[PDB]
Ligand binder design. Sequence first.
Ligand SMILES: [Ca+2]
Lengths: 258, 7
Amino acid sequence: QVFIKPEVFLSLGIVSLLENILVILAVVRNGNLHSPMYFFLCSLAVADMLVSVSNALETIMIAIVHSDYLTFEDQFIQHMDNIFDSMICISLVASICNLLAIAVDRYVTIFYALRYHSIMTVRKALTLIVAIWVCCGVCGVVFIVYSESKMVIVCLITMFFAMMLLMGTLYVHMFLFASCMKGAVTITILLGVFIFCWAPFFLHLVLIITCPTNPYCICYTAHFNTYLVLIMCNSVIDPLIYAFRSLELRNTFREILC
Amino acid sequence: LDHXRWK
Ligand SMILES: [Ca+2]
């Protein structure tokens, strides 16, 4: 019952795409940002790229079909919807898994800071990254090809809720110390932006599964299209936190302009 | 089609 002009979706998508392109090109063009913990921040950039590209393309297609220009063999629209609605179910499980991997790597380097170079090497990190993306690819397709059911929604709910518990545990550990003072402060922000942005949408579908026909909930979901602009704003914020908290990445950006 | 899913 509320609407948002498509220009918002398109602009946010393009801007976040440019930011993530800059992050990945900066990592590759540099020779010191090749540590295995700095590749997970590239995999996260890829996940946010997926969200932005899919949303921009879906908006373009909806606006094109709405206008008086083509006819699209109804099966075909229902097919590209599932293509587009499936590079967001992948770029959610991938984001969750990558945040877990970053947190586990930081915990290993903070509490086991003796053989981190022996155990967590560059090649092993690459193997973990490719395994995570391969697994999340299947996870995000099985769900969307089987979305008519009710188990997928509740499974997503428990995934988000459990990762919320992990964030809370990490925070309560942050205030009781007994490298660490400044180590896990990044993954504390990156886990506090993902939750702040994917939370309004996520309880939106604990409601429709609990209180569909109820005059309170009904006027809650009625603002659905503005819980999706928040999902983009997680992808326009994440690359900024890397810039304002990692030093040598900033100096690389200076090389980008000159 | 429509934006997001489970709207
Ligand atoms: Ca859709």
